[PDB]
Amino acid sequence: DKICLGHHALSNGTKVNTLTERGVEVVNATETVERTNIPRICSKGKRTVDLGQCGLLGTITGPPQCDQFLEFSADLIIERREGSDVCYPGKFVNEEALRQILRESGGIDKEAMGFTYSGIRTNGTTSACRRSGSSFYAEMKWLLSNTDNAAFPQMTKSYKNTRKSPALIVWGIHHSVSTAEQTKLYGSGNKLVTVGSSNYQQSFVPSPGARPQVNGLSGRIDFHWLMLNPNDTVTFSFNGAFIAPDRASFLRGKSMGIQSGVQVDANCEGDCYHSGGTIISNLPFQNIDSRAVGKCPRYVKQRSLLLATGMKNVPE
Amino acid sequence: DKICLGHHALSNGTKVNTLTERGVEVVNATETVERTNIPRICSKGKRTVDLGQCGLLGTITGPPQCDQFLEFSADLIIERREGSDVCYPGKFVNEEALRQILRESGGIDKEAMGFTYSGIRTNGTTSACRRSGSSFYAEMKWLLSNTDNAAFPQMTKSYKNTRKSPALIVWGIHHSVSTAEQTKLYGSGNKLVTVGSSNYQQSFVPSPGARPQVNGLSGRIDFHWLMLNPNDTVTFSFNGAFIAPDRASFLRGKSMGIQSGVQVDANCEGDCYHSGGTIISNLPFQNIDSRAVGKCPRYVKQRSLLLATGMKNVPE
Amino acid sequence: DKICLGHHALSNGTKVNTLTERGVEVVNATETVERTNIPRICSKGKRTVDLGQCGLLGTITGPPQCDQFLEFSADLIIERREGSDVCYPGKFVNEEALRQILRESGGIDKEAMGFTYSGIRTNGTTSACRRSGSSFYAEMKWLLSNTDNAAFPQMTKSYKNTRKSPALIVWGIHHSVSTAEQTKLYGSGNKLVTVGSSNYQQSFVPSPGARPQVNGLSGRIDFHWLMLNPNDTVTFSFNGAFIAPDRASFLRGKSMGIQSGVQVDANCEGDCYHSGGTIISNLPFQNIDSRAVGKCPRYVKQRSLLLATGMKNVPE
Amino acid sequence: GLFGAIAGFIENGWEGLIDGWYGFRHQNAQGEGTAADYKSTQSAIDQITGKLNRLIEKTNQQFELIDNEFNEVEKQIGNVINWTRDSITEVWSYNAELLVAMENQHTIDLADSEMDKLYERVKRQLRENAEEDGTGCFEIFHKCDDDCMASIRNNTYDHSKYREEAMQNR
Amino acid sequence: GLFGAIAGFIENGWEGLIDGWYGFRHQNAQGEGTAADYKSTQSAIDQITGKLNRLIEKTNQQFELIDNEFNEVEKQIGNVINWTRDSITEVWSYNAELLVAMENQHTIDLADSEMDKLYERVKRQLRENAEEDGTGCFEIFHKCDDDCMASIRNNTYDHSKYREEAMQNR
Amino acid sequence: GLFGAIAGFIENGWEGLIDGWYGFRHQNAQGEGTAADYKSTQSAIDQITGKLNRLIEKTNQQFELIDNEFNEVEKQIGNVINWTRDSITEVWSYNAELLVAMENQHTIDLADSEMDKLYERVKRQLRENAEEDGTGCFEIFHKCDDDCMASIRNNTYDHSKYREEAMQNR
Ligand SMILES: CC(=O)N[C@@H]1[C@@H](O)[C@H](O[C@@H]2O[C@H](CO[C@]3(C(=O)O)C[C@H](O)[C@@H](NC(C)=O)[C@H]([C@H](O)[C@H](O)CO)O3)[C@H](O)[C@H](O)[C@H]2O)[C@@H](CO)O[C@H]1O
Ligand SMILES: CC(=O)N[C@@H]1[C@@H](O)[C@H](O[C@@H]2O[C@H](CO[C@]3(C(=O)O)C[C@H](O)[C@@H](NC(C)=O)[C@H]([C@H](O)[C@H](O)CO)O3)[C@H](O)[C@H](O)[C@H]2O)[C@@H](CO)O[C@H]1O
Numbered sequence A, B, C: 001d002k003i004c005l006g007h008h009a010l011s012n013g014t015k016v017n018t019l020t021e022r023g024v025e026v027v028n029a030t031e032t033v034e035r036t037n038i039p040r041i042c043s044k045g046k047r048t049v050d051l052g053q054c055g056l057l058g059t060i061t062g063p064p065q066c067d068q069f070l071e072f073s074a075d076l077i078i079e080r081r082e083g084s085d086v087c088y089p090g091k092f093v094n095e096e097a098l099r100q101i102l103r104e105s106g107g108i109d110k111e112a113m114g115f116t117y118s119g120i121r122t123n124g125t126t127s128a129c130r131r132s133g134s135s136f137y138a139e140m141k142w143l144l145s146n147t148d149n150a151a152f153p154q155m156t157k158s159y160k161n162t163r164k165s166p167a168l169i170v171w172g173i174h175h176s177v178s179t180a181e182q183t184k185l186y187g188s189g190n191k192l193v194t195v196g197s198s199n200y201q202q203s204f205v206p207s208p209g210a211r212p213q214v215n216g217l218s219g220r221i222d223f224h225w226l227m228l229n230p231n232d233t234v235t236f237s238f239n240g241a242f243i244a245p246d247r248a249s250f251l252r253g254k255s256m257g258i259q260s261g262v263q264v265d266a267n268c269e270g271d272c273y274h275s276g277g278t279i280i281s282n283l284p285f286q287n288i289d290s291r292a293v294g295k296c297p298r299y300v301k302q303r304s305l306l307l308a309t310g311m312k313n314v315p316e
Numbered sequence D, E, F: 001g002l003f004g005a006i007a008g009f010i011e012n013g014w015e016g017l018i019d020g021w022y023g024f025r026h027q028n029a030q031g032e033g034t035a036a037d038y039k040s041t042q043s044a045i046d047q048i049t050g051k052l053n054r055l056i057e058k059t060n061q062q063f064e065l066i067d068n069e070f071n072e073v074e075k076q077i078g079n080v081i082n083w084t085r086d087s088i089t090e091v092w093s094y095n096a097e098l099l100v101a102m103e104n105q106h107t108i109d110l111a112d113s114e115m116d117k118l119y120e121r122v123k124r125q126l127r128e129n130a131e132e133d134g135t136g137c138f139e140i141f142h143k144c145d146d147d148c149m150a151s152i153r154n155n156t157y158d159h160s161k162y163r164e165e166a167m168q169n170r
């Protein structure tokens, strides 16, 4: 006598939201927000440099913990909490900008500046930089006065960048523990150091005095830097208190840099990284870490947003 | 003979926009963009500190107008146009960053630094800071030479932060009106002041000379600051021209800070504030002030966007 | 016997995307993303100043290449790659901020500062600034010592802004090629220069030494600036090495500034500009240049996004 | 609308219908009468109010000052801040305009739909005891008194009782 | 589409129909003829063009340079600017893709709807003088000449005149 | 839904229908039987899966660090960065919520539509050999055996063969 039309259904559906309604049940649904983390740095197929105890900025100056990273090459660069940029106490001016440059550099290639010296010492060391006895930053030279209290002659050294890419140049300024110890190392008087490139124009007078003991030492070294363009020339006029560059750095290509406290893993692949690991997902959104980097789903505040993949569930 | 189906209607509807059409009339509609302001700061239920004539940065140093705000506690902090951070002419280096820190601090608790002095004066005052006669910044001490033209001995004072939260440290640098008046106060020669923390590394040589008369005075005091981490130590090497901290500040918790020219009101509650008052609304958008802060509807350029809540109006 | 209903169709439709489907063919469609560039600066109806060899910051100081731009007036300002801000080698401190101010200034009106000098020279020139023989920055004055090695008296000159809008003030600091050549020009000793406005507080000690030869010269001039509010006073205390302002600049109104390497055209009108030209379009999006300025379609990464303007195409 | 009833094959609405959104207006031996349909009215109302509750909410996300109205921040950082704020304003201004337009399109289509659902329900009840007028009305062949009209409105109308007489009157 | 006419129970469109979007094609004693329906064509056209006018507009919002193409800004501020711009680009690229996709879905459904509305109108006119073929066509029992066909197209067809003869021919 | 079939004039779904999304359940001399309709099931499945493939994709847009988790950046620049990131988070959180809600509305309406399209197809086949029950069912006047029921399901049912006997049994 008859024929009826119907549709499928379940006892229990999956709740989802619509424009009209909160929590309507449907036959099937799927998640749009990724919550699953992988607690490793998934580096399969990538030239990876895990810096460990080397601070990223130390790759340019060369404290002993960075001796194996002086000319690294990389697609992915990993910074660690235990990393240190220095051996002798000190810091970099404009430090975070430089980190950003080096994170995407693809690594660094080094080349001699060509400085030669007359009428001064060039082999200053310290106990804070240990290479089987006292040493110094591998890429730098501690410029001194020939003997104690001896004058430091007003010097002018120059370096032209003869390559096709910009050169990263770093120099330092030593602030001694006292007014006396500055005169001992570089002679008395007001020491000045100046720096002039096509793009750049600055000067540096030192400032000795007592700092708190770091690594057992109360002296400090400022580190400064600039990018020298192709065919541009840079000049250093200095009366003393100057840590001279021995080599210049050039950027190899492209990379990405991350900060992390988890192990490397060459068995998994990923392009979205955070300090807790890797987000492997094709979902458009994620609720794991708003500071994740690489190629990532968009961060959202919601833990879950279910997309209906079935009709409305209308049970018996 | 018949039965007809119909729907309700009005003579006049409310115009709204759709994907297809501008100004289609519907039976009922409602506003999505808030235009109603309340011209008071709605502070019901909130620990509120209205700074008035006290500048926010003055809570740390203590000019007379901030004497009642030296250890304030707050959920909401209100800055006023008449506020002043200083009594003796001067300003802060990195001033806006510090304001941002103090706006969300939840207020400040103060504690003695512990500095004691020998071979110098510590009680310098001025007519610009008035507390029944001449005075100075309550939390600071104007360090001088024992007598006129007398040398100022190269000093080193230190302070370790022994608490669980970072310490806000402020010091000052006095630039006198002339080259002569600097020697009078602190003796002749090139005065230097240095500052070294785990995170921080800087120095300060003064610069006397004539400025325009502010409060009747042509001298200035620079104010500088840093955040000292738990168990970190800070040291001050100074040859003179130095305004020494007596107390350190610690942040209590959480707050929000606003700027406003309208009265406080404890009879209304709100979480979205601007200089003209409070936006009380549950609408998703607002066209009152793009710089409103707190928990606010999103600012949009349109004055009005009506949402249909009824069918299309089709009158007789 | 019958009557059939149908709809129109074509042999070939235009592929478009939907929520459900990639590449469904429809009867007609239209582009939403602009790809057509016009390779000129469309300036019809606009007061336009093409700076050419004049650098924008040079309009304030007046090197010879900017002599015809000292008081320009504009709706649209065009910077060129060949532009130079200087004649005598040097640069500006806070240079990009100042550019941003001048780009939207509507141009500048100039007025004498009113400085008069006694006991010194005021007519210093150079071969790098050529106006039929050696000259200098038109709006500035190179302040010297009466004769070689002669002392430079500690001076104090002031200027009050008596107009209704803020005054742009620029001054300079000459760093000579050597320690000797500084004493020749301004006498021996530590030269200091200070600057104090209601909003502003700073100082400037020079730093002579050898820089690379630019325009054949190894000296440099720093240029510094501040905005002086109505009724505010600014004072200059200087011991030498100071390039004094002759005139102050005031901002005329409103403009927009662009950078470009293409020709001006008064036959076409546009409000969206980039270095390659003008985007003339009413489409909501563009894929030409993410740094386009003015009133522009929104930049998107897709080259094309077609909007259906017809039904689905269902051919025979 | 998409369903072609409201401002479609129904000429217009009734200003007399203050009872609800949708209703019936009949004609018979006893005369004319008009009444509202609760179920349809309520289904539309519930759906619209559910849109509202979803949109009329403010986020718990706090934002602070990053510039200063009494003491201008440095120009470069100030220009970056303003550029960013203006860029965000442009995004929200677009979002708001698009949201309301698409919601409004859906709301009108939704009301059109509910009218159609009610119209079709009634047709399905009558089962060859009536024919379509085409103006949103049903011509009834058999005699349907006020008692009979109410049975249609309340979904208790038995087509089999009046079938033969209506069938014959074709 | 959602309404199941275009690419649904109608097999395909007519490439001969250059008169409008929708139309009638009849068969009778005089032969075959085809003509366009103005009202339906115009309603779809007006709705689509109204989408266009709404989207094809540019905002009066001005933006300025915050970086420099001839003289690079400081690196840190430059990286913040680029990160922000790229973040904005990603938002607009999403907005544009979503807008066009959802508009396109609605445009196709809208055209499907208008076809259905026209089909249903005609059914409602014929009132038991015709039956549904099921391919988007109406088999007419009584004789309908070219004069008669035009009356259907122009909404002037009186079903009561031809009722008895069509009814009998069931 | 907008089309009033699912959770509309059909009371509920069948938990026994594991064959597909939509189907037929008949009653006749041989008894009751149930089977799924491939075409309708597949059209809904294809449309939904096409939504998925469009949304389940990640962009090739790379972003880098602009702040530091081991060595805090300067406070002012840090606060601008955080304000900007939080502003972006708020935009995406809105976009995600709106996308899923509007997709979900459309998905439910889309399934409702497909059911209706199937229901209407069958009505159009039967052509006066059946009448509408009103619960999503067709009462057949003539005798329709299992062979006959299968012909309806497979679109091979010839109404003209059974017309006279069904017509008479009105
Ligand atoms: C050898 C000598 O003349 N004096 C010895 C003292 O140096 C020594 O006191 C200890 O000194 C330690 C610092 O020593 C260095 C260092 O940094 O390791 C030694 C470096 O050769 C010297 N380098 C240069 C280029 O001058 C370096 C430098 O002067 C400072 O770092 C500048 O700030 O100092 C350290 O301070 C110890 O805490 C301290 O006891 C005493 C005691 O061992 O013996 C002396 O013979
Ligand atoms: C008492 C004395 O030796 N000289 C008196 C002059 O000071 C006074 O000239 C007036 O001086 C005013 C400034 O005076 C102070 C101040 O700021 O109020 C007084 C402070 O004690 C002093 N403090 C310290 C630590 O030195 C302070 C300080 O030197 C400067 O602020 C540094 O810039 O100066 C003010 O300039 C008046 O305009 C001026 O007339 C004269 C006349 O009253 O009487 C002298 O006896």
Ligand SMILES: CC(=O)N[C@@H]1[C@@H](O)[C@H](O[C@@H]2O[C@H](CO[C@]3(C(=O)O)C[C@H](O)[C@@H](NC(C)=O)[C@H]([C@H](O)[C@H](O)CO)O3)[C@H](O)[C@H](O)[C@H]2O)[C@@H](CO)O[C@H]1O
Pocket: C124, C125, C126, C127, C128, C134, C142, C144, C175, C176, C177, C185, C216, C217, C218, C219, C220
């Ligand atoms: C006239 C004199 O006393 N000495 C002549 C030398 O100056 C000259 O050496 C050449 O000097 C060139 C620089 O000359 C200027 C300049 O910039 O053009 C000349 C300006 O009058 C002088 N201005 C002032 C205010 O002092 C200016 C200034 O001292 C410096 O720019 C400061 O840095 O210098 C240039 O360096 C040439 O390369 C150099 O050969 C010699 C040779 O021509 O003749 C002397 O009579």
Ligand SMILES: *[C@@H]1O[C@H](CO)[C@@H](O[C@@H]2O[C@H](CO)[C@@H](O)[C@H](O)[C@H]2NC(C)=O)[C@H](O)[C@H]1NC(C)=O
Pocket: D068, D069, D074, D075, D076, D078, D079, D082
């Ligand atoms: C950034 O935008 C603000 C406004 O949002 C600008 O401040 C306004 O400036 C105009 C013109 O001087 C004044 O009329 C207003 O009183 C100001 N409003 C506020 C709220 O401050 C500010 O100038 C812009 N920043 C920069 C660097 O140009």
Ligand SMILES: *[C@@H]1O[C@H](CO)[C@@H](O[C@@H]2O[C@H](CO)[C@@H](O)[C@H](O)[C@H]2NC(C)=O)[C@H](O)[C@H]1NC(C)=O
Pocket: E068, E069, E074, E075, E076, E078, E079, E082
């Ligand atoms: C920010 O992005 C711009 C591009 O939008 C970068 O400038 C480009 O740099 C590349 C590589 O050096 C050059 O090939 C282009 O000529 C540049 N384009 C423009 C428009 O300037 C810039 O380097 C980025 N900023 C930073 C700090 O990395």
Ligand SMILES: *[C@@H]1O[C@H](CO)[C@@H](O[C@@H]2O[C@H](CO)[C@@H](O)[C@H](O)[C@H]2NC(C)=O)[C@H](O)[C@H]1NC(C)=O
Pocket: F068, F069, F074, F075, F076, F078, F079, F082
């Ligand atoms: C900007 O936001 C970050 C978090 O995204 C803040 O850093 C956190 O600070 C809290 C409170 O001190 C700590 O508990 C977390 O460990 C920090 N998280 C990270 C990822 O660093 C940071 O303080 C904010 N910046 C500023 C200037 O306030």
Ligand SMILES: *[C@@H]1O[C@H](CO)[C@@H](O)[C@H](O)[C@H]1NC(C)=O
Pocket: A011, A012, A013, A014
């Ligand atoms: C229905 O309820 C049962 C009760 O245990 C639960 O396990 C199941 O997940 C529910 N079904 C669905 C599809 O969510």
Ligand SMILES: *[C@@H]1O[C@H](CO)[C@@H](O)[C@H](O)[C@H]1NC(C)=O
Pocket: A028, A029, A030, A031, A309
């Ligand atoms: C239901 O959807 C999920 C998505 O999470 C999918 O994995 C699964 O295959 C689907 N199952 C059925 C029966 O459709």
Ligand SMILES: *[C@@H]1O[C@H](CO)[C@@H](O)[C@H](O)[C@H]1NC(C)=O
Pocket: A120, A121, A122, A123
């Ligand atoms: C460093 O160099 C000087 C001579 O230039 C030499 O006399 C001295 O011994 C050297 N220092 C060391 C530790 O060998």
Ligand SMILES: *[C@@H]1O[C@H](CO)[C@@H](O)[C@H](O)[C@H]1NC(C)=O
Pocket: A230, A231
């Ligand atoms: C640099 O100068 C040399 C001339 O010695 C030339 O070969 C090279 O092409 C120049 N490159 C640039 C970028 O100016």
Ligand SMILES: *[C@@H]1O[C@H](CO)[C@@H](O)[C@H](O)[C@H]1NC(C)=O
Pocket: B011, B012, B013, B014
């Ligand atoms: C219709 O017009 C009258 C004329 O005064 C106006 O007051 C009223 O607001 C209008 N109705 C609606 C609902 O807007």
Ligand SMILES: *[C@@H]1O[C@H](CO)[C@@H](O)[C@H](O)[C@H]1NC(C)=O
Pocket: B028, B029, B030, B031, B309
């Ligand atoms: C119409 O909508 C408004 C929203 O502004 C609401 O306050 C009012 O109660 C509604 N009135 C009716 C009659 O639906």
Ligand SMILES: *[C@@H]1O[C@H](CO)[C@@H](O)[C@H](O)[C@H]1NC(C)=O
Pocket: B120, B121, B122, B123
């Ligand atoms: C400040 O201290 C000195 C001694 O340290 C004292 O002689 C002098 O009187 C004090 N100043 C005042 C105003 O009391």
Ligand SMILES: *[C@@H]1O[C@H](CO)[C@@H](O)[C@H](O)[C@H]1NC(C)=O
Pocket: B230, B231
């Ligand atoms: C600081 O050092 C003391 C040891 O005197 C210890 O009790 C405390 O836990 C330390 N806290 C931190 C954060 O290092």
Ligand SMILES: *[C@@H]1O[C@H](CO)[C@@H](O)[C@H](O)[C@H]1NC(C)=O
Pocket: C011, C012, C013, C014
């Ligand atoms: C259909 O194909 C022809 C083949 O040349 C092509 O030219 C034409 O553009 C196509 N039609 C449409 C409307 O795209």
Ligand SMILES: *[C@@H]1O[C@H](CO)[C@@H](O)[C@H](O)[C@H]1NC(C)=O
Pocket: C028, C029, C030, C031, C309
């Ligand atoms: C088709 O759309 C285009 C938009 O690019 C328009 O210019 C043209 O007039 C339209 N043509 C027809 C036949 O509708």
Ligand SMILES: *[C@@H]1O[C@H](CO)[C@@H](O)[C@H](O)[C@H]1NC(C)=O
Pocket: C120, C121, C122, C123
């Ligand atoms: C500059 O001024 C001095 C006197 O103030 C004058 O003697 C000298 O000749 C002037 N310089 C030139 C080049 O005329």
Ligand SMILES: *[C@@H]1O[C@H](CO)[C@@H](O)[C@H](O)[C@H]1NC(C)=O
Pocket: C230, C231
């Ligand atoms: C500046 O001061 C003068 C008094 O000489 C007055 O006329 C003018 O109104 C003042 N303007 C401002 C903005 O203070």
